[PDB]
């Protein structure tokens, strides 16, 4: 056999009552769906957000993609309109199979994708569209304030919990009250697909959820691995493609690849599949590896998503980043402290969950400060870390974005290390160093206490 399709991931068909609140729904399905990494959600049949777009006025520049298994691709890096892209895309698939596009079976495209990527003699290239929601490339969902009168049907979906523009700013999102420069994680991204255009194996930034909606067009085929098996997958991948695991100079140089799910399955990594059709959602859970390809010309929209369930995994993720020397998108501790400073307006369940994470943060910080004092760092000064651009507050050694504290030395102006890397700053003795801290321990306990009062 060439390709043995992985088993199907779970599919949910919520009632209107179940669907109305996405956070409740996603919490409810977690015990099932976290075991598979991905799941598919079919909205109720009358949930039909209208899509409108001028195919001649929307412009984008897609990336050329070689389709070679295990070959390195960079995670981010010729102008088309949506019309001219669609014409290219349709002609490509039509010519590839010598058939009309709807007649090409999904099973065949999948088999052929996996043949094509493993065959060295084949050098098939396609074009992959990825674009932030913006003035120049709008969301597929309705949004306010475009200097345009919206239809009543459009207005029905402005405030939907499953309008991907709203999910990050709803009260149950833990990023709802955050306002650091992290646009990539509260704003949707648009993906214009064609036959075989592919998303390599990856997990989301900070191990966040993702929500993915296929607005229209031909299906999107997915493979997913549960969070629990993330390190098994990485070990399998490292053995077969070690070049992908060399550390990156920055966060725009991440290496990813196409890899046959049968290889993962041969090494006892659990993998699930689905074909996502127009009008369906795919949800990826924290640290759930996923990859896939498009069956044909299509239009998808996705957003990162951080719930109360995610919060403690977010802390683990930043620890894992420190161990790997990987750059952070934002400071998790900064997020926690921001939320604490708004305790009175938080959702009560969010308040309760932030309180728990904050207690861990404070105890770890207490221990770290005791440790650096014993190393002979004596001098200290308060510092408003949040005011520094990220690249001015990264640990020299592990690249973590500092917030709670860091160590500086006047012999190396502007350099910082986190409290795990006091020995990596410079050759001067520790009495010349200064502990730079955002809060005293006595500042922190009342912040956590406000959260407790809000939580009731
Ligand atoms: C939430 C959107 N986002 C942030 C974008 N930035 C990293 C640039 C992602 O990474 C999503 N992960 C990539 C991806 C693509 C696709 C696709 N082309 O259908 C499906 C699943 N995952
Ligand atoms: Mn090939
Ligand atoms: Mn993704
Ligand atoms: Mn001062
Ligand atoms: Zn460090
Ligand atoms: Zn020094």
């Amino acid at each position: 056999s060439m390709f043995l399709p992985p088993p199907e991931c779970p599919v949910f068909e919520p009632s209107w009552e179940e669907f109305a609140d996405p956070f409740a729904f996603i919490h409810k399905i977690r015990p099932i769906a976290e075991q598979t990494g991905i799941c598919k959600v079919r909205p109720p049949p009358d949930w039909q957000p209208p899509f409108a777009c001028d195919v001649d006025k929307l412009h984008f520049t897609p990336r050329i993609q070689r389709l070679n298994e295990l070959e390195a691709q960079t995670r981010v890096k010729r102008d088309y309109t949506l019309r001219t892209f669609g014409e290219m895309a349709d002609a490509f698939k039509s010519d590839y199979f010598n058939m009309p596009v709807h007649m090409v079976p999904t099973e065949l495209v999948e088999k052929e994708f996996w043949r094509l990527v493993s065959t060295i003699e084949e050098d098939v290239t396609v074009e992959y569209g990825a674009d932030i929601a913006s003035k120049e490339f709008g969301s597929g969902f309705p949004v306010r304030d475009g200097k345009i009168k919206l239809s009543p049907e459009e207005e029905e979906y402005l405030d939907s919990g499953w309008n991907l523009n709203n999910m990050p700013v709803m009260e149950q999102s833990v990023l709802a009250h955050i306002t650091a420069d992290i646009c990539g994680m509260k704003l949707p991204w648009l993906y214009v697909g064609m036959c075989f255009s592919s998303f390599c194996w990856h997990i989301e930034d900070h191990w966040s959820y993702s929500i993915n909606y296929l607005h229209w067009g031909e299906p999107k085929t997915w493979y997913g691995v549960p969070g629990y098996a993330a390190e098994q997958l990485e070990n399998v991948m490292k053995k077969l493609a070690p070049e992908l695991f060399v550390s990156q100079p920055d966060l725009l140089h991440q290496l990813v690849t196409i890899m046959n799910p049968n290889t993962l399955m041969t090494h006892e990594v659990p993998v699930y599949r689905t074909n996502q059709c127009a009008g369906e959602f795919v949800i990826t859970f924290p640290r759930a590896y996923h990859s896939g390809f498009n069956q044909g010309f299509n239009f998808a929209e996705a957003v990162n998503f951080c719930t109360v369930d995610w919060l403690p995994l977010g802390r683990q993720c930043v620890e894992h980043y420190r161990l790997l020397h990987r750059y952070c998108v934002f400071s998790h501790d900064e997020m926690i402290c921001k939320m604490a400073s708004k305790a009175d307006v938080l959702d009560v369940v969010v308040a309760s969950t932030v309180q728990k994470d904050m207690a861990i943060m404070i105890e770890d910080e207490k221990a770290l400060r005791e440790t650096v004092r014993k190393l002979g760092v004596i001098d200290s000064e308060r510092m408003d870390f949040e005011l520094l651009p990220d690249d001015e507050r990264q640990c020299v050694k592990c690249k973590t974005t500092c917030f709670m504290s860091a160590i500086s030395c006047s012999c190396k102006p502007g350099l910082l290390v986190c409290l795990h890397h006091v020995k990596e700053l410079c050759s001067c003795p520790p009495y010349k160093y200064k502990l730079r801290y955002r809060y005293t321990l006595d500042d922190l306990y009342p912040m956590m206490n406000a959260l407790k009062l809000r939580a009731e």
Side-chain angles (χ1 to χ4, degrees), residues 378-391:
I378 301 166
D379 211 44
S380 74
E381 197 179 342
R382 183 184 294 268
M383 193 168 86
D384 297 331
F385 284 89
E386 73 275 19
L387 304 179
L388 282 170
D390 283 4
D391 66 5

Side-chain angles (χ1 to χ4, degrees), residues 274-311:
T274 203
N275 298 316
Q276 175 187 27
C277 300
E280 305 179 330
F281 285 95
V282 170
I283 300 173
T284 70
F285 276 67
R287 212 193 186 174
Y289 269 97
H290 53 282
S291 67
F293 64 87
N294 294 299
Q295 291 273 338
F297 179 41
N298 67 14
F299 190 102
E301 180 162 4
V303 76
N304 295 111
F305 184 68
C306 294
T307 66
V308 294
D309 295 332
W310 166 82
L311 214 37

